[PDB]
């Protein structure tokens with residue numbers, strides 16, 4: 001048997017806001033967080049825009065001196081994590097610290113730090129490399145620094161599954177609790193890949209929208225004029241908690257995490273199969289994990305990256321899994337507004353999926369002006385749709401054909 | 413209810429050999445894999461040696477067409493994975509491909525690739541960044557590429573827990589099988605951090621031995637004259653398999669994986685606590701997980717990095733866990749010979765722990781000329797020690813205070 005897992009705390013940095021409620025307010029108003037990237041010369045680049053975190057003050061969380069030791073992706077992960085733990089009301093004690101762990105991931109990790117240290121290395125040789133280069137750049141330092149700051153002695157790890165990281169982090173954290181290896185986990189992801197290497201790297205793959213004249217219209221999942229994803233920064237963190245532990249201290253419970261699916265496409269390094277066979281297996285795995293019939297799903301927060309092949313693969317996958325119910329559920333891509341936070345995408349979209357359940361509203365797919373061939377599902381074009389949502393799925397599909405699906409249900 | 417997990421296949425690139433048997437021959441003869449680094453100019457660096465993989469031919473495993481797209485850590489991870497899968501005799505089919513997954517991790521991933529593309533960006537601009545920069549550099553692409561080439565549709569993910577990565581990867585892969593999420597997992601890790609940023613970055617932290625004039629004597633775990641770890645390259649992969657699945661196909665079983673522990677130190681970003689409190693908590697979690705009396709432990713493959721603080725912390729942890737039995741078990745650090753493979757350290761050491769069980773021999777801690785204050789256990793100084801080994805433990809500890817322990821025992 002298995003213990004039940006609930007969500008008692010959430011935290012976020014996104015292109016829409018410096019916390020969950022500001023981010024969610026933008027989501028429900030169909031606001032874009034996409035803009036030309038500032039304080040960085042992108043003249044030589046084919047993409048000049050993305051989703052930046054605007055006005056982040058790390059000194060709300062850390063001393064300037066401790067913040068100087070950490071890449072921006074670690075700062076963003078710690079910000080989301082501290083928010084989530086504060087939002088949970090959890091009190092860490094000598095009696096429970098061994099039962100409280102962390103799994104905060106990243107898809108690409110410390111590119112900005114690597115970039116700045118390469119500069120030192122190439123210009124001035126190796127002796128000018130920061131002593132904090134390694135610990136301040138490696139992906140497991142959000143889990144590390146959080147555990148040290150809060151005295152958490154539970155399972156301490158980090159996932160890195162590219163664009164699936166945040167979904168895998170939350171799912172495997174839920175497993176740790178379900179199987180009695182922890183009572184509480186802080187889980188999610190963070191990303192800051194808006195440097196030359198990130199914009200240049202995805203740019204060299206021709207993976208990015210180049211709609212420089214209209215950045216807010218660039219991310220247009222399932223629209224016939226989409227031309228690739230929009231690179232975005234930020235972080236999401238959830239406090240996952242065993243139900244009886246949450247009830248005992250009188251925690252406010254947002255929702256229950258009832259299912260987690262994983263699958264590998266085993267198809268291509270960067271492209272999904274056109275029929276979405278991998279995403280279909282993964283969703284079926286998640287629904288079997290939750291003991292739910294496909295008919296019980298009301299809302300899907302799609303991966304919905306605004307790539308030609310990715311968006312059409314997800315329609316095919318949903319039709320395959322849900323058959324005569326595929327049109328009854330609502331499915332939207334919040335990436336139409338946030339852009340693609342890569343390893344944090346699954347973390348912020350899990351939060352949006354939980355809030356869709358709290359507020360009984362499907363977030364919109366903005367910019368869906370002309371649905372493409374076969375994109376005839378309820379994709380919540382343009383504006384939020386209030387509706388009954390008992391069960392919400394959040395899907396992530398990443399490089400290496402790695403898939404994750406989370407199943408949340410209303411808790412009462 | 414929880415299923416049993418056995419080791420049916422193993423694969424390796426190390427500084428001592430291009431497979432498991434050649435590496436193991438080196439381990440049992442007390443041979444050093446450490447040498448001045450030849451693949452770049454280190455005259456400006458404070459450390460100019462490490463454990464390189466010698467004579468690796470990627471065309472033994474991959475088309476030169478596919479190989480050119482991939483960082484060395486991915487090439488090394490794939491080589492070790494391919495070796496492990498062949499060694500297992502497992503046939504991948506439509507009937508079992510959804511039940512076979514992969515969890516190959518890395519501490520740092522494609523730092524060489526990122527450095528080389530950073531050089532291109534800075535000297536020549538963004539249009540010279542490789543189209544393969546992202547899929548060729550990010551940590552989950554061992555798992556990704558392995559799944560694509562072999563058609564593995566099971567759980568597909570990657571851990572990154574710095575120097576604990578290989579141990580966590582194997583333990584969590586075993587949990588996957590234990591809990592029924594897969595029947596087979598390929599799990600381990602790979603690392604190639606021997607670039608300017610890697611040697612420069614660890615150099616800036618003063619974490620590396622600077623014994624440039626005697627590289628084979630540099631790695632001296634528990635010796636009073638130790639002055640930091642030696643940076644080494646390679647990969648370990650194990651095929652983990654549910655017991656009844658292995659029995660049903662006539663698999664050769666090397667050993668049983670009975671125990672896995674994790675803990676966080678919650679102490680310091682980089683330094684372990686002097687008293688080994690976190691390591692002790694981890695080992696106790698693993699021994700309880702395996703249903704063992706601590707007196708059943710015969711051999712410990714120590715983390716044993718040859719750092720002042722790390723080595724003495726491990727003695728303190730072992731004395732705390734084992735009390736008087738600490739003087740009866742054998743404990744050795746194969747890092748004395750291989751150096752520190754970082755994310756791959758736990759993967760190769762798990763393999764050395766399994767072969768310790770197969771061959772009933774404790775590998776030596778070479779260079780242990782003058783054991784330091786309190787290092788008065790059987791550390792198997794200088795020469796391999798044939799002895800009864802029913803239960804073997806492999807420990808890893810990393811940046812962020814992240815600890816892992818695996819417990820293996822003989823299978824009949």
Ligand SMILES: O=C(CN1CCCC1)Nc1ccc(F)cc1
Nearest residue numbers: 430431434472473494495496498
């Ligand atoms: O293991 C080797 C070759 N060995 C390594 C050192 C001496 C000879 N090759 C290999 C194994 C599996 C596979 F799928 C493809 C190639």
